C-alpha cells in the first residue's frame, strides 16, 4: 500500500507543509461553518463552467479556485497551473490529481487540527489496534446479566456516547473518580478496554456499583438515570443542581435521548382541552397487539382514542361523552429509543410474552407522529431482542457500527450478521439515530 509520493515531496519542505495543513484546516472549517446558499455558490460553483454540483467540486490547496469533476475542470487547472491538490467540498477529503486518487491514509492530514502538536501526538499516542478499532467484544454473562450486557452494547456503540466518553468530558469533571463507586466512570472503563488496552474489568466494576443499589428496558431507564445523577453530582453548586433537576439538564442523556410528548385530552361536547400536558420521555412504549408493522404501532400510538372513564362529567360542560385523547411528539430526541411492549402482565397474576414479528424499517420517518410537516428521518443503529419465555430467557443485542456492518452480541459471542438477517429479529428495544431533517 503506497502513499501519494507528490504530497510526500511537499512535506520535505517544512514551511510548505504548514501551508498545506493550514489550508486543509481552513477549508474544512469553512465547510462546517457556511450556510447552504453560501456553500453552494462559493464551494460548489465551478471556476470554469460556473455550474453548481457538476459532480464533486474541489477547492484548490494553493489558490482560491474551485473546479468541478464531471467536466475535469479541476484536472485542467492542475495541468494548466500545476496545482495538483484539491479538497472535496462535500467531505473535506484531499485529492491528488496526479494519483487520480484521494489521500486518505496519512494521519497528519486526517488529524490536521493537531498539526501544531504533531510530534508530541504521534510519539505519545498510537493508532488503535486492529482488534479494538470498533470496540467489538463480548461481555460474559456470569449471573443472569444479558439484560445488562445487551443494553450496554447498544450504549457503547452509540455514536453520541462514544464521542462523549472519548472526549474525556466525564473524566475531567468527576468528583468520585472511582469505577467501583461511580457509574459513568465504570462505563468509561469499558470504553477504555473495548477501544484501548487496559475485557470485563469495566463490566465487573459495573455490577459493583449495582451492588450499591430481569427486564432490559427497566435497566435502560435505570442506567441512563444513573449517568444523569453522575452529572448532577459533579455540578459546582446547589443552583445548577436545581436546574438540572427541575428545568433543563444539559448532560449527555438529556441532550441526546430525551424528547417530550404532547398528551392532548379534549372533551367532544365543548372542546375543553385542559388535561393537556407536555411530558418528557426518554423512550416510547408501543402496543403491538395484532399489529404487523412498526408504522402501524406508531399510528396506534398517535391515533385518537376515547377515554373510558367512569362516570366522567366534563369539568366544563357536564357532558358524559368520553374525553378524546391524542398523543403526539412535541420534541424529538437525537436518538429515539422505541420499546415494543412484548411482556404483557395479566390481572390474573401471570405473564405473557407476545412473539408477534413486527416489521421495522432501517430508516424511520417521524413526520406524521408530531403535532401542531417535512421529512424527519432516523437511521436504525441498534436492536435488543428477547429469546425464550417470560421466565427463562436471554437478551441479545445487534449494533450497526461504522461502515454499515451489523454485529450480533450473544454474551461472549460476537458475530457478523447481514442487515437482511437483523431485520427479521423479534425486536424489543429499537435504537434510531437522527439522520436527516428537512
Amino acid at each position: 500500500m503506497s502513499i501519494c509520493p507528490h504530497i510526500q515531496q511537499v512535506f520535505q519542505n517544512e514551511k510548505s507543509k504548514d501551508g498545506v495543513l493550514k489550508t486543509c484546516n481552513a477549508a474544512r472549517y469553512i465547510l462546517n461553518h457556511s450556510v447552504p446558499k453560501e456553500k453552494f455558490l462559493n464551494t460548489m460553483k465551478c471556476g470554469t463552467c460556473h455550474e453548481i454540483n457538476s459532480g464533486a467540486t474541489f477547492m484548490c490547496l494553493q489558490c482560491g479556485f474551485c473546479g468541478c469533476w464531471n467536466h475535469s475542470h479541476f484536472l485542467s487547472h492542475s495541468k494548466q497551473i500545476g496545482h495538483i491538490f484539491g479538497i472535496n467540498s462535500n467531505n473535506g477529503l484531499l485529492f491528488c490529481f496526479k494519483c487520480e486518487d484521494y489521500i486518505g491514509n496519512i494521519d497528519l492530514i486526517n488529524d490536521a487540527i493537531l498539526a501544531k502538536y504533531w510530534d508530541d501526538v504521534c510519539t505519545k499516542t498510537m493508532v488503535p489496534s486492529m482488534e479494538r478499532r470498533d470496540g467489538l467484544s463480548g461481555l460474559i454473562n456470569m449471573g443472569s446479566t444479558c439484560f445488562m450486557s445487551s443494553i450496554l452494547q447498544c450504549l457503547i456503540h452509540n455514536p453520541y456516547f462514544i464521542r462523549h466518553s472519548m472526549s474525556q468530558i466525564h473524566s475531567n469533571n468527576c468528583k468520585v473518580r472511582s469505577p467501583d463507586k461511580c457509574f459513568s466512570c465504570a462505563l468509561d472503563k469499558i470504553v477504555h478496554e473495548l477501544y484501548g488496552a487496559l475485557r470485563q474489568t469495566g463490566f465487573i466494576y459495573l455490577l459493583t456499583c449495582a451492588w450499591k443499589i430481569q427486564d432490559a428496558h427497566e435497566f435502560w431507564q435505570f442506567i441512563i438515570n444513573q449517568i444523569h445523577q453522575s452529572y448532577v453530582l459533579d455540578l459546582p453548586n446547589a443552583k445548577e443542581v436545581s436546574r438540572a433537576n427541575n428545568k433543563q439538564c444539559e448532560c449527555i442523556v438529556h441532550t441526546v435521548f430525551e424528547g417530550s410528548l404532547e398528551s392532548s385530552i379534549v372533551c367532544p361536547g365543548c372542546q375543553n382541552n385542559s388535561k393537556t400536558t407536555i411530558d418528557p420521555f426518554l423512550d416510547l412504549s408501543l402496543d403491538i397487539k395484532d399489529k404487523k408493522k412498526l408504522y402501524e404501532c406508531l399510528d396506534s400510538f398517535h391515533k385518537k382514542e376515547q377515554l373510558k372513564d367512569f362516570n366522567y362529567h366534563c369539568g366544563e360542560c357536564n357532558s358524559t361523552q368520553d374525553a378524546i385523547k391524542q398523543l403526539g411528539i412535541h420534541k424529538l430526541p437525537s436518538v429515539l429509543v422505541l420499546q415494543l411492549k412484548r411482556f404483557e402482565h395479566l390481572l390474573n397474576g401471570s405473564n405473557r410474552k407476545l412473539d408477534d414479528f413486527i416489521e421495522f424499517p432501517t430508516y424511520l420517518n417521524m413526520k406524521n407522529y408530531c403535532s401542531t410537516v417535512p421529512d424527519i428521518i432516523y437511521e436504525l443503529i441498534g436492536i435488543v431482542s428477547h429469546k425464550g419465555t417470560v421466565n427463562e430467557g436471554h437478551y441479545i443485542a445487534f449494533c450497526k457500527i461504522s461502515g454499515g456492518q451489523w454485529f450480533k452480541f450473544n454474551d461472549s459471542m460476537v458475530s457478523s450478521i447481514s442487515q437482511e438477517e437483523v431485520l427479521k429479529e423479534q425486536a424489543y428495544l429499537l435504537f434510531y439515530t437522527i439522520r436527516q431533517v428537512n
Partner: protein
C-alpha cells in the same frame, strides 16, 4: 408550459430580485456549526434547543488514538489536553 421549449432567457420580472474560496473565512468565523442536511428552522421547531447533533454519525469510524502510557482511547480534540 412545455418541456421541449427552447429557453430564451430569465423572466425579466424575476430578474428584478438579484473569486477565492478562502475569502469565505471571515463569514465562517461568525457562523455557527452548519449541517449538510438538517434544516435549522426545523431543528428549532422539532428538536430541543440544547440538542446534540451528529450528522452522518456512521459515515466514518470514530477518530481516536490510544494513549501509550495508560491505554485510554482519546478523541482527537481530547489528545492535547490529555498529554499536556
Amino acid at each position: 408550459r412545455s418541456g421541449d421549449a427552447e429557453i430564451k432567457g430569465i423572466k425579466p420580472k424575476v430578474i428584478e430580485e438579484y473569486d477565492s474560496w478562502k475569502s469565505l473565512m471571515s463569514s465562517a468565523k461568525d457562523t455557527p456549526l452548519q449541517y449538510d442536511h438538517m434544516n435549522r428552522e426545523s431543528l428549532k421547531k422539532a428538536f430541543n434547543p440544547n440538542a446534540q447533533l451528529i450528522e452522518d454519525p456512521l459515515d466514518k469510524p470514530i477518530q481516536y488514538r490510544v494513549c501509550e502510557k495508560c491505554g485510554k482511547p482519546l478523541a482527537l480534540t481530547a489528545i492535547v489536553d490529555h498529554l499536556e
